[PDB]
């Protein structure tokens, strides 16, 4: 890594969790290669001999730890360790069968959730497939729940080598969509034909969009559909590329302004010298975000709190 470039800066105290994430990344096949450097010099290169083999991925993870654990743990002042991480989120898999089953049970906990209610004279809902003697729609016996739309479970042929895959199998519904006492025939309910699989390819299941009803037409409905798996990117960062991580021998200063006790801006200035342009640019990014809604890399929402990062030049004299 190079000073001031885009990338992550881990403090010494947190080296263990950082390496664990790289290990997990190697294990779940997110990370294809990691080039390791002690200070400015490249000392090693970690990569599984074949990504499709579990043993090779574990071997890579063990080697990574074995190499760096002493260097990081005993890191002196001015010393640092840089990781250049060739990653590709599309290759990421679910390596644990327990994790796949944990998603299936998560999906199964929705089975009783009603998607469409039984129809009334006022409101559209579930009606019977055949009309009464007079040629008007009659209410359905039961509401449309998730259990009626699809069943869940992991797909056959999964393994720790290749990865497990939670699968959704579309059900069958005879009941249709309409109003009770209406002459127009109930609209057929389109069950999920797509997005039936989820391998977890660097994404997580968006439950706001997954197994949701989509009525088309408005006042006069013409089509009703229920979505399959609709995912969301678990991070804002690009799917493929290379990322730089750096561990340094510096203490982390958490300044929570909402806390009962925190370091005042005065005492912080007293303790460190900050680059004026680093501050001014951060301040401008805050003012711009406050007044105009303009978002920036410099100021960001993390865990219900706006935060800025400063790496001061050094401590202040006196």
């Amino acid at each position: 890594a190079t000073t001031g470039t885009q990338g992550y800066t881990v403090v010494k105290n947190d080296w263990k969790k950082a390496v664990k994430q790289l290990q997990d990344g190697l294990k779940d096949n997110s990370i294809g290669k990691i080039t390791v450097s002690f200070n400015d010099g490249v000392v090693g290169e970690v990569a599984p001999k074949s990504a499709n083999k579990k043993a090779d991925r574990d071997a890579a993870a063990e080697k990574l730890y074995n190499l760096v654990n002493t260097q990081l743990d005993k890191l002196g002042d001015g010393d640092y360790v840089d990781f250049s991480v060739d990653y590709n989120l599309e290759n990421k898999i679910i390596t644990n069968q327990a994790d796949a089953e944990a998603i299936v049970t998560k999906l199964n906990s929705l089975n009783e959730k009603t998607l469409i209610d039984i129809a009334t004279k006022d409101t559209f809902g579930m009606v019977s497939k055949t009309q009464d003697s007079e040629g008007k729609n009659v209410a359905a016996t039961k509401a449309l729940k998730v259990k009626d739309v699809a069943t869940f479970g992991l797909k056959s042929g999964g393994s720790e080598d290749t990865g497990y895959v939670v699968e959704m199998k579309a059900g069958a519904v005879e009941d249709k969509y309409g109003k009770v006492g209406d002459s127009t025939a109930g609209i057929a309910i389109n069950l999920p034909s797509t997005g039936l699989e989820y391998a977890g390819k660097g994404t997580t299941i968006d439950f706001n969009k997954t197994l949701k009803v989509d009525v088309t037409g408005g006042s006069t409905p013409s089509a009703v559909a229920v979505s399959g798996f609709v995912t969301k990117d678990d991070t804002d960062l690009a799917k493929s590329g290379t990322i730089n991580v750096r561990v340094i021998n510096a203490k982390e200063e958490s300044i929570d302004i909402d806390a009962s006790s925190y370091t005042s801006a005065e005492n912080l200035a007293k303790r460190y010298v900050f680059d004026p342009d680093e501050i001014s640019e951060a301040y401008k990014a805050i003012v711009a975000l406050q007044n105009d809604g303009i978002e920036s890399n410099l100021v960001q929402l993390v865990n219900g709190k706006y935060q800025v990062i400063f790496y001061p030049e050094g401590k202040r004299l006196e």
Binding site: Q6, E253, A265, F274, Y306, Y311
Partner: protein
């Protein structure tokens, strides 16, 4: 959402807040305190002599960020530590010559001053002191004795003395060395010591290398001297100070001699006159003066204006934006408060240099408020 930090950084500072406004306020304070502990410097020693040395060591032959020069200098301007009157107009000389203005005791050259001279000029035993090393003595024998002049000569330095029978003749000696090259000169009354110090920074502002001279005239006389008239020739004159410093008679006298109508920058007192210098558009532009110096006004004692004398050249040449000197020992005047307010930009000040010890805290605090520091 992060950058790769330097290996030498002492901490990772993460400042968090539920409300963006509370963060805004914190980061604003941080900026202020950061800049203030960086750009609000005091430059003072235990003596007036030490203050001048501190100024020289900080700004001349210095690696300091705002130094006037980083290499050794070839010129010193020396002034009698008590005699503010003799060296009164020496600041523009010091500016033009790229020289510190040092203070010395009249009888014996102070060892402190001797050491600083060696340092700032880079004088050494093993290296020859060529004829380019020059020391100007601003004042007669009653301010800087022959004993001191000979002691400077003995060290191996060229020593030129700029003096006359009185303050007026001495000012012309100094003003003559500076030269009236840009068809412009400043005039101050004999008793207008604070006024000369108000304008000294402005006079010290160089244009194509040249500073502007300051001439002291007898403010209660019927006419100015033949020597003053001869020196002033046909130049534009700005009189600094009120009627009680330079009379109506003297203004006419200067008008007649030069043939050009002299301007007058003045107030009811010294602090008002100081404010007017800042307000004057010819000397400073509104919303473009960011660098400021502060020194005592000399209300308690007149000779305590030597701090401003030593500082004025530096103020004139400061960074890439000339600075005024605000004259205030115990309290800022109402006129000064206003003056700075109109002078400083929307962003606020970027440099504040307190010169000397006995300047009251309220003064610096007021200045810090006015400059948003």
């Amino acid at each position: 959402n992060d950058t790769i930090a330097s290996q030498d950084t002492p901490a990772k500072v993460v400042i968090k807040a539920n409300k963006l406004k509370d963060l805004k306020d914190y980061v604003d304070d941080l900026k202020t305190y950061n800049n203030t502990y960086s750009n609000v410097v005091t430059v003072a020693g235990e003596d007036r002599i030490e203050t001048a040395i501190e100024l020289s060591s900080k700004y001349y032959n210095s690696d300091d960020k705002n130094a006037i020069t980083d290499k050794a200098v070839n010129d010193i301007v020396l002034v009698g530590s008590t005699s503010i009157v003799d060296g009164l107009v020496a600041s523009p000389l010091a500016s033009e010559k790229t020289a510190p203005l040092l203070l010395t005791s009249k009888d014996k050259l102070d060892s402190s001053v001797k050491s600083e001279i060696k340092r700032v000029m880079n004088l050494k035993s093993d290296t020859g002191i060529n004829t380019s090393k020059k020391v100007y003595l601003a004042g007669g024998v009653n301010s800087i004795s022959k004993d001191v002049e000979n002691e400077l000569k003995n060290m191996g330095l060229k020593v030129t003395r700029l003096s006359g029978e009185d303050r007026y003749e001495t000012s012309l000696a100094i003003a003559d060395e500076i030269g009236l090259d840009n068809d412009k000169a400043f005039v101050v009354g004999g008793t207008g010591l604070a006024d000369a110090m108000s304008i000294a920074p402005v006079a010290s502002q160089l244009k194509d290398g040249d500073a502007t001279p300051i001439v002291v005239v007898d403010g209660k006389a019927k006419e100015i001297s033949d020597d003053a008239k001869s020196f002033l020739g046909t130049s534009d004159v700005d009189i600094i100070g009120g009627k009680n410093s330079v009379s109506k008679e003297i203004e006419e006298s200067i008008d007649s001699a030069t043939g050009k109508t002299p301007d007058r920058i003045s107030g009811d007192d010294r602090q008002a006159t100081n404010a007017e210098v800042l307000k004057e558009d010819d000397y400073f532009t509104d919303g473009e003066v960011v660098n400021y110096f502060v020194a005592k006004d000399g209300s308690t004692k007149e000779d305590q204006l030597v701090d401003a004398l030593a500082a004025a050249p530096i103020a004139g040449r400061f960074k890439e934006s000339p600075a005024p000197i605000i004259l205030a020992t115990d309290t800022l005047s109402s006129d000064q408060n206003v003056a700075v307010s109109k002078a400083v930009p929307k962003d606020g000040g970027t440099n504040l240099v307190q010169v000397g010890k006995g300047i009251a805290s309220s003064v610096i605090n007021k200045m810090k408020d006015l400059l948003d520091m």
